[PDB]
Design a binder for this molecule. Sequence first.
Ligand SMILES: *[C@@H]1O[C@H](CO)[C@@H](O[C@@H]2O[C@H](CO)[C@@H](O[C@@H]3O[C@H](CO[C@H]4O[C@H](CO)[C@@H](O)[C@H](O)[C@@H]4O)[C@@H](O)[C@H](O)[C@@H]3O)[C@H](O)[C@H]2NC(C)=O)[C@H](O)[C@H]1NC(C)=O
Ligand SMILES: *[C@@H]1O[C@H](CO)[C@@H](O)[C@H](O)[C@H]1NC(C)=O
Lengths: 132, 132, 132, 462, 51, 51
Amino acid sequence: AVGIGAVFLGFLGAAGSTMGAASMTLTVQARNLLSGTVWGIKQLQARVLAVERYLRDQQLLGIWGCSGKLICCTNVPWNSSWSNRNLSEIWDNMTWLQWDKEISNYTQIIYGLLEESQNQQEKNEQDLLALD
Amino acid sequence: AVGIGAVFLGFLGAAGSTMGAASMTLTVQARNLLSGTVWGIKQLQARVLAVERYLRDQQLLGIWGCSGKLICCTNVPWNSSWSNRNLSEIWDNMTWLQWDKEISNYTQIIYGLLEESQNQQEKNEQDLLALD
Amino acid sequence: AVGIGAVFLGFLGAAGSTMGAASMTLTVQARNLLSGTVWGIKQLQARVLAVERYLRDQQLLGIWGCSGKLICCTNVPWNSSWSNRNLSEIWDNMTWLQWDKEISNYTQIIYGLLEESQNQQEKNEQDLLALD
Amino acid sequence: ENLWVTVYYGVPVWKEAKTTLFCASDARAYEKEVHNVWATHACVPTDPSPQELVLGNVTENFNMWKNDMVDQMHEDIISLWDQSLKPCVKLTPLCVTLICSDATVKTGTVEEMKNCSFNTTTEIRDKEKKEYALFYKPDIVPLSETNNTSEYRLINCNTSACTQACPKVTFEPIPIHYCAPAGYAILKCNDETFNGTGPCSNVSTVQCTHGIRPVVSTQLLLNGSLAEKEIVIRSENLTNNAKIIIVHLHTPVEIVCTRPNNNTRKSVRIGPGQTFYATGDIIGDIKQAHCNISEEKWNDTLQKVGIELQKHFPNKTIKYNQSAGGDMEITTHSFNCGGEFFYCNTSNLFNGTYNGTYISTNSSANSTSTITLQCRIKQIINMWQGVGRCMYAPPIAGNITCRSNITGLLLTRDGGTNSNETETFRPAGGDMRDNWRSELYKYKVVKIEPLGVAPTRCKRRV
Amino acid sequence: INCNTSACTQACPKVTFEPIPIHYCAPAGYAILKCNDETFNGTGPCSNVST
Amino acid sequence: ELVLGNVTENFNMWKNDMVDQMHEDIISLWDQSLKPCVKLTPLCVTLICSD
Ligand SMILES: *[C@@H]1O[C@H](CO)[C@@H](O[C@@H]2O[C@H](CO)[C@@H](O[C@@H]3O[C@H](CO[C@H]4O[C@H](CO)[C@@H](O)[C@H](O)[C@@H]4O)[C@@H](O)[C@H](O)[C@@H]3O)[C@H](O)[C@H]2NC(C)=O)[C@H](O)[C@H]1NC(C)=O
Ligand SMILES: *[C@@H]1O[C@H](CO)[C@@H](O)[C@H](O)[C@H]1NC(C)=O
């Protein structure tokens, strides 16, 4: 109304559209987050920090795979302790805002698991290169 | 004479060799564009801005695919309004400098089209992951 | 003991474990190298330079392929002048520290060769896109 | 098969770095008043943990006298100090003819307390007030070209304008646990014996150095670390008479200093804004600045040093002597206890020699016998030879006392062609670089160099 | 009055002192939200929210 | 344009630290703009006057 420009050039507009909506739009959100006497320091710090944040996130995305698709399968199963909701409930009713309030726990658990499944794949690929 | 070092360590040397020439050389051009009291601000600003420009371009390349190959097919057809020249004329006679004087129009049209064809591919891939 | 955190959150711990050890661990090393009145300049310079170094290395990795796997085959054969050791000696007995003392010669030779084999692949791919 | 090349990103190797470190302040010296704390206000607080490594089978070459890091440290101290004193206390108006008379005379150290009068600027520029204060070291200089008259000048009127101090600022060493920037790492030697250079085999990683409290001192060094196992004698070149020997002692020695006299303070407003501080009075008794050190411990130390020193200077007697001579800034021990600046004559701390038997014989006793050194206190000093950065001390109201857990030693060597049966060791010092070098040496800074190459023979299908 | 206090200045005579609105903007990575709600006590769960 | 739809959020005026940024800058901007001029120290002399 609004549309993608306001929602993602601007931010967080889709938070009220439930997470299934995201599948058609999470593109622009990323590109518009990378924009660009004593005040010179204030401005330089801001610019540098924005860059650092961006790059650090890219580093994790790289490490875990896949990663240029923005939506990736990492071939790690879910722990049953995290399966207290139906998938339809998650995708059709819940928002990212809402999901994120509870799923926020075990952050590093997920990261650990992601790093390791990727490491295993990599070894298998190296063996295949060596075998072939 | 010259050679790649002068042409692309240095810049724009191939502009006079017509665009078909580019297919064998557009490599170095990219790497040498990423090099590195009050003057400290002047220097910091320059460094930061060079980085920002680089990263912003990388962001678009990522979004549109493919993108690490530097030359990519995006599976978007040409609008006939843009087909006023023969392909041989474009590749053998014209320069990038020259092409760019006219093809400069409709910049955002192309970007819009590129973003969307990529979005469509991504949905199909997600469905294939789900189906498989 | 130690473990990955101390070895690679901290640095160079695996240098004493010989290079074959590296195949299971060179992950964390990379992510922890990208962390973040007049002293404001000192700090800004440090931050910027760390970023520049990172990005420049990424640029070469991109150019040569493959490159997101951190370990890549580039399909370039070895020159016999560089084959004065057995592969088992290299992987099981030598360290990266040690290898690097001698293999340090001919740095640009390798880079030249890597760039070119990648260029050749790219042309063949463009012809295949055109043929198909 | 045929061998094929692969590239390895992120390999654990390194090269010598030439970079800078930073605060890393201790996050404990921080309170609201930190803005009044020298070299803390300016710094960023951190709280990093120690490193586990242990680099296994890795060994590396260290060299204390080539570690450029010390210069970074030196340069910053000079510049931090100076910057912290800019917005206050310009003393230019003070340089007027001073009129004065004798204390009591008698003791040379009391005679100096001159009753000094002058005529100066009041709140209204048009008027002058006759006023007075006590001064005593010859920072007060007989006026040039007078003839034994009551007229004096300030010492820095044929030099450059001086400042006093921003009165609010605290000068107390806070350890800075210097940390590396991303891309850099710090290595340290955990080895004993270590000459100051060579292939350390017990090597550990460092994220941040152990913090070190800066101290300005000469000759005997205070508030430093102790050797873990044995006295270490270190020198760039033992045979080079121009070099200074650095000694790390194993056990602590305690030093007690004081300025016993009940002192008062007064201040004078000079023109607008800024007030000047000076000693008001000293209510009746007579002072002697001094430092009491146990002799017992002292003798034990000198012979233990002599025993170790004997290794490089075998079959010879070790003799100690006094400094070469010069201004107190050159020859005396220097302390900043309480913020006051002391000059302490070494006489007769190094009045001895030991027969090359160095017999470690002593006994239990109820004796508390000490060696007492006497001191002198100045008001205007050239901070680190910063004549152009000269400053006048604020007075402090009190019976000032000072402890310290001591000491590091700075020594030199002498003796001509007429000896070589014995060698003479004298007190040495004056270079701030060595004061830090002494502890900084433990660390080396290196750069992580990712991305290496190796053959594998494996090939990519494509 | 200020001789028993500190030195004062007058003004650079050329300078204009007139309030100019500053439409403060966020750095990249940040966004600003606002309440479009009436009633609002100064705190609480605004329901009419705009970027 | 947003309008965050179905999103609601908690606001609190007396906790918004932003005001301090604003306060601090005004103090510092004001002061800096007046440095290169009009020192009045010479003025502080005995003044003579009448009704
Ligand atoms: C630093 O070293 C200083 C130099 O020694 C210390 O000064 C000593 O401090 C003690 C405590 O003030 C003084 O003690 C006085 O001792 C006399 C005793 O001496 C008289 O009687 C003995 C009997 O053996 C006789 O041997 C002496 O000749 C005297 O006849 C007492 O009478 C006093 O009332 C008081 O206890 C020492 O005199 C003093 N030595 C001096 C003044 O040089 C100083 O304390 C050490 N530490 C400090 C704080 O400076
Ligand atoms: C210094 O001289 C003045 C003149 O009033 C006198 O009042 C003051 O007592 C003297 N101070 C000392 C230390 O005698």
